[PDB]
Design a protein around this ligand. Structure first.
Ligand SMILES: Cc1ccncc1NC(=O)[C@H](C)C1CCCCC1
Ligand SMILES: Cc1ccncc1NC(=O)[C@H](C)C1CCCCC1
Lengths: 304, 304
């Protein structure tokens, strides 16, 4: 028992991190097979950053201008291409530490682990959610660009995020591994509106189930609700409307605990309307939304 | 910017995890050089667990009774010995993935990362603090015994914890890597008093500094306090008394932000006396104590 904000073991991803330098800029790259992936803004300088013309900036670069170093060793670049907001540097050596991997585009509300890196070296790992507004609330300083987000299913790493930018509000934006930004963001130093965010309702319910499984049950009440009634409350409190698909995903947790999903919704309604009254749930004094129902099941069953 | 509960990259520790089986019991072991370390209770059965006579139980075991498997490969055990609550199984092969490492006994209030494992396979990584009462609030199910806690300083892994037991209260207990329990705990299935715990004051102050560095400053006030006055408040609220040694450790954060440590203490006093008023600090609705001043500096500077 006990419930923690757990990240995936980062070892398989640590073996893929490299440092990429182009001119004056250094950031992180992801070396999988014979390709190194990194944010395309590695080719910019300070003057370029307001509205870079990436196609033109890249035309001034040759394979030998991209310095790729995997700690002790220098990689030989034999090709370069830009795909959306990422550069793909073909190298002459396949990464001997390439794990089984996939590139996936995650949905908002899904979670993943980030391995924060500086100069191609890993500094730490943390779990986070892709906000409904397509931002992430990470921990990234200048130089962390190119750090990646991922999930692991047995021996397969699904890479879902590459870090590109910090918005002026201090929230983070990035792309899938094909270089497509999550959200409306563009890789330029401009103020950019992140949409209105919402709380991930299905994740809060999943975390309430993890709380009951682990002994925190003070919030369970004698009430029930309907999806319609609950969604009026979700509306008032900027929570995502709950759907039958969300109820269906919560099925295993509802079955294991014997607490009907709409009964848990009535606990959540009361917590939204009355607050925690100075109490905590799983060490938190707020309603946590960074655990998906899959995360709760995985953690509560000890999946490796 | 942004501040997260970050764990160390777990790769160097993943390469050391093995599965140890003795009879009917399977748990995790730590393979460093030619020795595998695991909790001594791997030699117990269900009948033994109320008050095992470990010396007698171990005498019924031979090297060939300890089955050690590092995924695809079986290790040959050529020696066994019990040191405090750990067993040390000498194997004929040095772990080729042995990182530079140290065994350290951490102080209460210090933090570390745990790589939770089942059957020698890593499931996840999380950061936690050793409570002032020598327990940890982890996430461990049956089979996670032998999972370890550690810190990393550049290329050196300092192992500080091995998981042994879940107390009847759902909190966790374990040993240093010489098998000495942190706290009063004994490896037997009995109800055991964990002392009165307290909040790690120096860590809360460090986290208030991380909050100011990252833009959350609403809690700063026009007041100051003294160590004496602050400690009367710390007393009332079950916080550790602050000492000049704690003020000294906060020096770098005080210098970087320009907020005198006693001025931050006066912010903390007001938060203790008035609560958060429904507001948050770094995404938390409570005063966080799982970040040491060293953690804050490391995270806010991007150390690898
Ligand atoms: C500073 C920082 C901190 C954390 N994460 C990222 C960054 N870097 C930036 O967001 C650049 C300013 C941006 C990058 C995209 C192109 C325009 C320039
Ligand atoms: C169940 C569980 C969950 C999480 N962590 C550990 C455990 N296992 C135990 O604490 C045993 C009961 C204990 C181990 C010490 C010797 C007496 C028996």
């Amino acid at each position: 028992s006990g419930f923690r904000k757990m990240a995936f073991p980062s070892g398989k991803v640590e073996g893929c991190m490299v440092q990429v330098t182009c001119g004056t800029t250094t950031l992180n790259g992801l070396w999988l097979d014979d390709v190194v992936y990194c944010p395309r803004h590695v080719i910019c300088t300070s003057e370029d950053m307001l509205n870079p013309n990436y196609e033109d900036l890249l035309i001034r670069k040759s394979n030998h201008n991209f310095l790729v170093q995997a700690g002790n060793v220098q990689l030989r670049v034999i090709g370069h291409s830009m795909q959306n907001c990422v550069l793909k540097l073909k190298v002459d050596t396949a990464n001997p530490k390439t794990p089984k991997y996939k590139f996936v585009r995650i949905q908002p509300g899904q979670t993943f682990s980030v391995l924060a890196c500086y100069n191609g070296s890993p500094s730490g790992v943390y779990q986070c959610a892709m906000r409904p507004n397509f931002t992430i609330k990470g921990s990234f300083l200048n130089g962390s660009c190119g750090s990646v987000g991922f999930n692991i299913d047995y021996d397969c790493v699904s890479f879902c995020y590459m870090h590109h930018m910090e918005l002026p509000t201090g929230v983070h934006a990035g792309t899938d591994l094909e270089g497509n930004f999550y959200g409306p963001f563009v890789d330029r130093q401009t103020a950019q509106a992140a949409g209105t965010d919402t709380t991930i309702t299905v994740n809060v319910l999943a975390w309430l189930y993890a709380a009951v499984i682990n002994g925190d049950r003070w919030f369970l009440n004698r009430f029930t609700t309907t999806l319609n009634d609950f969604n009026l409350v979700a509306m008032k409190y900027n929570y995502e409307p709950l759907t039958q698909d969300h109820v269906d995903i919560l099925g295993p947790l509802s079955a294991q605990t014997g607490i009907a999903v709409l009964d848990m919704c009535a606990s959540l309604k009361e917590l939204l309307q009355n607050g925690m009254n100075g109490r905590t749930i799983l060490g938190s004094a707020l309603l946590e939304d960074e655990f998906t129902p899959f995360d709760v099941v995985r953690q509560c069953s000890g999946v490796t």
